[PDB]
Amino acid sequence: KKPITIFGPDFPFAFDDWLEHPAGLGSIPAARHGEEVAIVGAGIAGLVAAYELMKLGLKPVVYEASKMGGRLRSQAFNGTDGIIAELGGMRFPVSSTAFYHYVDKLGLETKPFPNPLTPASRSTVIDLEGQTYYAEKAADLPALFQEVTDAWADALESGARFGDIQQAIRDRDVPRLKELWNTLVPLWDDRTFYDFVATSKAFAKLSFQHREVFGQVGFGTGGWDSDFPNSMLEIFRVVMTNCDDHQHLVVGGVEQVPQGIWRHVPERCAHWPEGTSLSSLHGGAPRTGVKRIARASDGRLAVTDNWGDCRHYAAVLTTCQSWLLTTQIDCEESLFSQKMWMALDRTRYMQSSKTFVMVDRPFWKDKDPETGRDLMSMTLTDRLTRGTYLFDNGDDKPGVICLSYAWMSDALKMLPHPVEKRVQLALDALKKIYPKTDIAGHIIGDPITISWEADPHFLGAFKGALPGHYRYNQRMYAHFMQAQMPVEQRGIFIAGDDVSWTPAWVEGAVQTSLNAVWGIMNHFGGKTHADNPGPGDVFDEIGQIALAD
Amino acid sequence: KKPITIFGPDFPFAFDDWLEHPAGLGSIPAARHGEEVAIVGAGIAGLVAAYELMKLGLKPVVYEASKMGGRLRSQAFNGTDGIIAELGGMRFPVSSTAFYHYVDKLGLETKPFPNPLTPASRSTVIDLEGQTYYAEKAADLPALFQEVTDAWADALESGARFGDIQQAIRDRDVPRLKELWNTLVPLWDDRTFYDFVATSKAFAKLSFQHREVFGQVGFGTGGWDSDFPNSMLEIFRVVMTNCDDHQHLVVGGVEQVPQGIWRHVPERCAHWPEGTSLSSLHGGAPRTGVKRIARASDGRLAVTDNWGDCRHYAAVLTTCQSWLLTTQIDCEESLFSQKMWMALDRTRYMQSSKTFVMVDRPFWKDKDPETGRDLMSMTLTDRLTRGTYLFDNGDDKPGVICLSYAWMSDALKMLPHPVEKRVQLALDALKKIYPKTDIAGHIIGDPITISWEADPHFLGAFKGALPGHYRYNQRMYAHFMQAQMPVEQRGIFIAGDDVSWTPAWVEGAVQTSLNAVWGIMNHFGGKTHADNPGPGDVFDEIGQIALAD
Numbered sequence A, B: 001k002k003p004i005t006i007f008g009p010d011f012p013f014a015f016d017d018w019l020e021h022p023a024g025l026g027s028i029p030a031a032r033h034g035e036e037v038a039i040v041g042a043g044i045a046g047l048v049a050a051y052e053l054m055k056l057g058l059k060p061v062v063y064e065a066s067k068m069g070g071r072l073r074s075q076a077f078n079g080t081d082g083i084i085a086e087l088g089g090m091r092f093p094v095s096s097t098a099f100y101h102y103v104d105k106l107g108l109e110t111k112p113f114p115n116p117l118t119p120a121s122r123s124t125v126i127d128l129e130g131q132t133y134y135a136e137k138a139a140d141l142p143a144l145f146q147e148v149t150d151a152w153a154d155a156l157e158s159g160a161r162f163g164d165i166q167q168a169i170r171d172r173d174v175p176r177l178k179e180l181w182n183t184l185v186p187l188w189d190d191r192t193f194y195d196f197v198a199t200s201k202a203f204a205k206l207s208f209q210h211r212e213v214f215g216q217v218g219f220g221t222g223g224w225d226s227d228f229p230n231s232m233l234e235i236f237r238v239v240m241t242n243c244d245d246h247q248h249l250v251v252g253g254v255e256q257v258p259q260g261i262w263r264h265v266p267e268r269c270a271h272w273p274e275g276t277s278l279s280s281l282h283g284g285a286p287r288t289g290v291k292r293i294a295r296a297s298d299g300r301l302a303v304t305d306n307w308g309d310c311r312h313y314a315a316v317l318t319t320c321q322s323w324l325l326t327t328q329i330d331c332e333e334s335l336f337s338q339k340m341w342m343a344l345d346r347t348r349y350m351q352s353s354k355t356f357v358m359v360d361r362p363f364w365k366d367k368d369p370e371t372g373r374d375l376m377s378m379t380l381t382d383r384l385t386r387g388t389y390l391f392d393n394g395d396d397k398p399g400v401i402c403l404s405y406a407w408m409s410d411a412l413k414m415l416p417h418p419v420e421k422r423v424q425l426a427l428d429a430l431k432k433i434y435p436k437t438d439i440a441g442h443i444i445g446d447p448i449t450i451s452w453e454a455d456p457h458f459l460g461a462f463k464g465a466l467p468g469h470y471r472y473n474q475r476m477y478a479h480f481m482q483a484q485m486p487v488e489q490r491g492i493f494i495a496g497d498d499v500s501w502t503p504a505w506v507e508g509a510v511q512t513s514l515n516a517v518w519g520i521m522n523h524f525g526g527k528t529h530a531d532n533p534g535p536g537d538v539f540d541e542i543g544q545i546a547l548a549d
């Protein structure tokens, strides 16, 4: 059967094909080769855009105020080799084909993420209202869980034509996908996931306890209460495109993706010599942080860095989170329309906390001889840890445990504590669920924790779309199409997690980056190959619908 | 006409009559007089309860881990006498009769708060998408504003029977009020304010710009977008009891309320000698913070403070924010049911930021001769300041300006910055709105700002009720009614902002405090005077409805 991929629904453009096509992403007039283009941010969107723009014969100049890779971050444990903790993105649905084009281009290895109730996870434990349920396969779980999923499946079918939409994504039936999706947009934009569940027949006839459980752990593979405040359109996008299943981690860390792009020598270059990489073009590193972006008197854009070095560019791509433009960067008002500023100012963020420890061996695989249970499991609970993940690197090698993976309030509970106290609170809660298991006695190396908002170069882990925010996301997603814009707003671009329709998923950032690649190519008078048309070529036809005032 | 008051709708008990009635709140047996009851928190809920329990002849012992007065907090500017910035609650609707009982008992002066489009405010300025509208009265605004309000009024009438609910509150017609209120509870518990507006007929026929405006500034007297994610029941409670209009500030600072309660000598004391106050009973200060609460081997509760001093009490009232019980305080699991712990952990909190400066005079009253406009006004904007308040202390005296009053995301945008940066960013934004006013040249004293979550004894400014949370709040609001509880769960009580049905409004804190006074009096074997029945005497009849599973 034809695979689900992140194919629209909003802009069902075949990004994978475009990348894969042997003609390449187009060209720029030789008169403009070597000319510079500024990119704010060295995250995935920034680097992808830079790598392809280098390939088209430009010299991208990448600015990074903090850490390379952005929210793709793999930190090594003390004293080990290649045993990492994933601090940002960690599980990558195979439906993320544009993302995976670069994984494979770098020849990196992946393996299935140990999600609850998947072949990759041996067992799962669900812990609710002080009671514990053990499961080696879904069916082992009590009846209430199956009832929960049936209502979910039923609510999606009733309320979204889920099956029709999934089929249209599989066959890449564009007119059909847009027909289905377009009738949904004005009906769910301004309603939350909460309202979805509240007004669905299936959930209504179930108990309050059923709903409660659905929020905490879903039907036993992960909960939904962090997402409840979101526009129901966001949630649809996630489940429709199977973002939530068949996921992989990158072996040795997904940070290798942005680090590898940086150092990768493409087989073919416009203008540039053999062996040119983003790294060689920069002398090894991106520029420091951007502090100011202004319209210069000669028409160009002035980018001043933290150290006062001011440079002039025909174009600038920003990928830093939207609120930074309006607070931390001095970004001149004339550079965006009044309605673009309002879209950027209304982006909201979800909070995330994760805490990791390394262990001497995957002791959790050991069986308790009394009960036949694994000593520990992929753990879902209403206690403060929420989610606990188990990473086996072999019996031969040390294991990693993500003790706690929380969002929103639960992440806010962890925010003010030092690492030590987070690890201790987690271990306490895990003692309650597994009173006989001695996790602490297997722990080696240093603990590793992360709170994203706590970083000054981030506002949260990723955006979450509020109800009614379709129009703001729509203006942002279309910002790379500049034919109709006043001159004073052109030549600046945006891309990234904020611009994407599926914010907590790395593919949306890659996709938005590629749209920007086209917007920038176009801005330098370039165009796509006739047999490999690009985002801007088809966007007025199949692009995200616009809503009437 | 008979006044709107915070009278139900959930628990329409006339707290004002109870407190005013010459019989007093009841009695406790003489054998129990002088006996101690522990109170965790020296905010308004703790002090109120301590004050009345002391009058019934008990010896309350108040613990405060941080500052007295809690979220009622009034900080003096450098070098001035009685010129303060309100850091917690600042505007108190006259419907808050139980709160005002204590204000009047202490003889404090109030004056109308300078809300937009009130007699207290000369002018208001609305700033949206770079466009500025000036108004001396509501009608001076563009038509869109009046349309917004007509839709809002219509939606409340259609959706909630607002006019009948307000009439019944006025007449204090309990059966009627509960009839009308109880049909709403199951319908709107699990839907947001967003969905209410979305799905209202009146808003549906208006443009998106109408809704947008309604979030940002409402119909010109304050916006609603920080409240959009909340259970609609919460919003109904606020508009129905007129919490949002006819508000006063306390002259010289609302912090005089709790401080004054601390010092106040009641005219009549059971047990205690002439001249007894909370302060004399404590030798001048509350005890330090609380670290531990446990059940002691003699049946009483053991409270251990930060320094290890352990003391025993027949009952304990806690008013600290609910998550502190589950994290910062070591509260023994046996003291609460499993379902109570769950209600306590589900509390989520709203964020707030305020920044204030003092000025040499209320220069904003001056007129621009060209336009006839006040040089500045109460300002509502989509820029980062959001809300700006002007406080006139007389032509004779310095002014106070609340430069910025923001919630949620807008508040989080400010969180990480020092005061100097906040002030500057505010001043920059106000310059855009008033390019001709020189605010900075009037500023004297030190700038004052607050971020509540940043404090380690607070999680946010106040709770916000999520959809679906009615049952949790119901369990918590009724926790004071202990006749059905297991012995091991009795004698501890909760009260406060978190316990209340109207969480950003001081009355709910006072009201819940008074319910627990009743619970504690009941616990010591006391009772209310036959002609002045108290909360627990009628609670089973008119108390908050309980929802089936």
Ligand SMILES: Cc1cc2nc3c(=O)[nH]c(=O)nc-3n(C[C@H](O)[C@H](O)[C@H](O)COP(=O)(O)OP(=O)(O)OC[C@H]3O[C@@H](n4cnc5c(N)ncnc54)[C@H](O)[C@@H]3O)c2cc1C
Residues within 6 Å of the ligand: A040, A041, A042, A043, A044, A045, A046, A063, A064, A065, A066, A067, A068, A069, A070, A071, A072, A087, A088, A089, A090, A091, A092, A093, A288, A289, A290, A291, A319, A320, A321, A324, A329, A352, A452, A457, A458, A460, A461, A462, A495, A496, A497, A498, A503, A504, A505, A506, A507, A509
């Ligand atoms: C906790 C968490 C879990 C996640 N899990 C998953 C997952 O399981 N699966 C999945 O697919 N995706 C996941 N993601 C999403 C993925 O991590 C992001 O979508 C993606 O990495 C965003 O890339 P980007 O370039 O858009 O932004 P980023 O990677 O943030 O890049 C933007 C960069 O701009 C930089 N910057 C900021 N200010 C300035 C300045 N003044 N000057 C210069 N540079 C600046 C920042 O420092 C940052 O490096 C997760 C994200 C988080 C936070």
Ligand SMILES: Cc1cc2nc3c(=O)[nH]c(=O)nc-3n(C[C@H](O)[C@H](O)[C@H](O)COP(=O)(O)OP(=O)(O)OC[C@H]3O[C@@H](n4cnc5c(N)ncnc54)[C@H](O)[C@@H]3O)c2cc1C
Residues within 6 Å of the ligand: B040, B041, B042, B043, B044, B045, B046, B063, B064, B065, B066, B067, B068, B069, B070, B071, B072, B087, B088, B089, B090, B091, B092, B093, B288, B289, B290, B291, B319, B320, B321, B324, B328, B329, B352, B452, B457, B460, B461, B462, B495, B496, B497, B498, B503, B504, B505, B506, B507, B509
């Ligand atoms: C920014 C803001 C604006 C507001 N505006 C308004 C308004 O305009 N109108 C209005 O009516 N209401 C308003 N309020 C609400 C009002 O201020 C609160 O409802 C009320 O003051 C809360 O009172 P409380 O006694 O329940 O809690 P607090 O005043 O929070 O409680 C008392 C104390 O518990 C203490 N404590 C914590 N941990 C411990 C421990 N471990 N041991 C001992 N003690 C501990 C804390 O230090 C705190 O002092 C506002 C609140 C805020 C934050």
Ligand SMILES: NC(=[NH2+])NCCC[C@H](N)C(=O)O
Residues within 6 Å of the ligand: A130, A382, A383, A384, A429, B326, B333, B338, B341, B342, B345
């Ligand atoms: N069994 C219990 N409910 N214990 C106390 C619960 C504390 C809270 N739910 C937490 O772990 O964050």
Ligand SMILES: NC(=[NH2+])NCCC[C@H](N)C(=O)O
Residues within 6 Å of the ligand: A091, A226, A227, A230, A350, A407, A464, A503, A504, A505
């Ligand atoms: N509202 C959200 N998108 N929440 C996070 C869910 C998706 C995210 N990529 C994860 O690994 O969990």
Ligand SMILES: NC(=[NH2+])NCCC[C@H](N)C(=O)O
Residues within 6 Å of the ligand: A326, A333, A338, A341, A342, A345, B128, B129, B130, B382, B383, B384, B385, B429
């Ligand atoms: N509402 C506006 N005029 N926005 C345009 C940019 C304003 C800027 N982001 C601010 O918060 O002050």
Ligand SMILES: NC(=[NH2+])NCCC[C@H](N)C(=O)O
Residues within 6 Å of the ligand: B091, B226, B227, B238, B407, B504, B505
């Ligand atoms: N509708 C609300 N609860 N809004 C949030 C702030 C409320 C607060 N009591 C005030 O008047 O400032």
